[model samples]
Target chain A: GSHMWIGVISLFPEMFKAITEFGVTGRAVKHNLLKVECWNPRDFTFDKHKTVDDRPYGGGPGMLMMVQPLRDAIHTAKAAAGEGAKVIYLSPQGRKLDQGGVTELAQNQKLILVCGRYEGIDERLIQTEIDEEWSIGDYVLTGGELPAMTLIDAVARFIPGVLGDGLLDCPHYTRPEVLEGLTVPPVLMSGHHEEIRKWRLKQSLQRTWLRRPELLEGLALTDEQRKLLKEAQAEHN
Target chain B: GSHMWIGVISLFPEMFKAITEFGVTGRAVKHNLLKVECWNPRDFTFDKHKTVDDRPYGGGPGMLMMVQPLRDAIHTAKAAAGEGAKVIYLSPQGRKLDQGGVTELAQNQKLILVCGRYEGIDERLIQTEIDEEWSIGDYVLTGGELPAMTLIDAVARFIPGVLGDGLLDCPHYTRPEVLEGLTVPPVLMSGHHEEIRKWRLKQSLQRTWLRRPELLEGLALTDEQRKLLKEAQAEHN
Candidate 1:
């Protein structure tokens, strides 16, 4: 079956209601291409007060999520997904997620995402139970829910039949071909597929190289790629 | 004015309808604090066909968005905002967006966001016009719209009077003190404000330090702060 499942561990399960109602992610859920279920760590608590966080023994800013409840929640979510499901904990320390990562996640039939709040979850819990630790980027967020949603959207685009077109996406343009007297690139009107292709590759390489050189690290490139990149860089200079 | 201004250069502006609907972002618009405007670069084309993308010059994977139309759109959006506005372009190669960055953007009276599509945008346009390049994380998405929205939500939480509590957010909890036989931590029930505060700080520091140490790289810390951090790290060990 092509059913994609996502089990979310979160304190504010209600926050996800909005996610389910809008955007491409919502469409994925509505169309039955994707399935999302929520799990609350508090549901596993035994105390009458139903606590979820505790103070660090050494003392330092925010509350640390308790170890046991989170651990149990992870187990429950994973077990419910049956076999072959991957349990991923959204954390700041994990490997950075990239386009390739999104494609990998899209291959999974089932995924369980744990969203941490307060300071974070117990390290022992993550080390023992989480199948993978994935970070959306180098930055930190108040919660992992948004990152989870972002992951869903990126991966969904790669799903076999999700996007109508096989191509990644069509080009986008905005108002005014000439704003403040600056005109649109003349080559775009050339209508030569070969010329257009060359122009695009140059732009992509230049943008990626200039903005995220870290991504280019160790990346294999062809001679043509190197040349186009050089050409793009030269034009800018 | 605190208005919602989204400068999206998309081949399919109709797709934006999904984003403008009732939700967190929509709520902001309903309150008249947000304005989402779309820019179709095709409209800027001088040619009858309204082309916006071209193949890579050196022969690559996908088309690159033409620089002229996209640049025009960005400039138009910025001009529309007049003054006191920041121009943010979403890309994988940009600085990673975090809670601090979100808060900083929210402080601005206006924000002009440019969404890139196809393979990517031209380097010259980015270098010449863009004020900030923001990445949701290291992951790649089909487009920048989702990342743009993620930032919008993260930043919205910090919009001075938007949150009822002056505090960013109070700690939240879910069901059960224990799940799958794991128990919640005990100090949470201690009910000592000073102890709770200390615990929270330790947890925040420990979590950030463990997961996203890069966040603290340039952060200057007082002698007392350093001592507190050292003590916290020792406890975890």
Candidate 2:
């Protein structure tokens, strides 16, 4: 099977349907390149009220998800994901997610993502059962569902058929050759494949350098990339 | 009205219900601290098929969202948001989002976020109509719905009565005060309000220092914060 299996533990499993059922992600699922299964922590609870959160000892504004139910949910995900599974807790305090991290995580056959709600999960569960934690950004959110989707989209792109073509990312344009007096760049419409490829590469490199310079830190630049980057730099000045 | 309204342009308008119907975000809407509206680009199209995308001009993978439909949808958002509304296009090539940026955005009365699908929206539309482009992280995603939610959740926290206590980020613990030989910090249970405040402040500073040290840049830390950071460093070492 050409699928990367992801098992997620969340209180709100429905949040995933939007990403998993639409756009490129939807296509990936339909093509059998990706599969996402959701597990609810509340389902693991035997209590009549199905309680998942409680007031914090420190008197916080919100509740913290109880430990046992989440722990059981993780065990279930890990069981489904098998031994290669990496249990990841989405947290603001974890390592910041980047392109390289997603590429690394994509190599795994299985991923068990735990999406926490309320204030957060109990500290002991993170210490005991989680292999890693990742944050989408510096800001805090109500829950971890969005971060999980962000990671899945990022990781799925690395699978062979997920994006179909081998292209990583390139500047794109649509109909209306001209808009507000700005015409499509001559290189794109030149009909020379080589020129178009070079121009697209240059644009991608230029955009990355200008917006996220930190990404290029360890990337080995080829002669062509170096030359194109230099040209982009000159144009910038 | 003491409210911040967000209008999102997306192909899949139903995706937003998860945030609008659940937990803290749901509560925010119920209390009138936040408002969210969705506009579908397809609604702006006249073509029988209601097509919103086309093959890229440069000939790359997937389609790029067409200009006019998205442009018209954005105009609708702008008119409803009225004067001083900011139209943000979510893209990997945009400014990286962080808590500081979130805090600044929270002060705004209106935000119109554009969620691009396929490869992305037309480049010219971004240049002409968008006030800014925001990236949740360096990692790419299926669309902007998650990023919009992340931004909104982060931004809403700064608004009074959103989190309600006027406090930001504190370490929390719950009942069963002790778990697996680990007890809740004694200071939390001391019943001394002043000491608890100092400890909470120190914990926040320490947590931020250890996890996101880059966030501390340009931050004017007081003498107590400086002391706490040193202690944290020593503990880490």
Question: For every candidate, how close is chain A to the native chain A in TM-score?
Answer: 0.84, 0.88
User: All candidates' lDDT scores?
Assistant: 0.67, 0.81
Please give the RMSD to the true structure for each candidate, in Å. 7.1, 3.1
Once superposed on the true structure, which residue ranges of model 1 sit more than 4 Å away at CA?
A17-19, A41-61, A64-75, A165-180, B1-83, B98-131, B142-145, B153-237
Q: Is the docking of candidate 1 incorrect, acceptable, medium or high quality?
A: incorrect
The fraction of correct interface contacts reproduced by each prediction comes to 0.19, 0.66
* TM-score against native, each model: 0.64, 0.90
Question: A43-135 in candidate 1: lDDT tens per residue?
Answer: 999999888877654344546777677778888998899999898988666767877788788889889999886666655566567899888
Mind giving the per-residue lDDT tens digits that candidate 2 earns over B1-237?
A: 478899999998888877787777878888888899999999999999999988888686578888889889998889988999999888777787877778778778889999988778778888899998888887877678777777877877766776741123556667677776777889878877788878888777777776666677758878977887677678778
Task: Put down candidate 1 lDDT per residue, B33-122, tens digits, no spaces.
Answer: 666677777777777777787654334456677766666677777777888777888876678676667767777767777777677775
RMSD of 2: 3.1
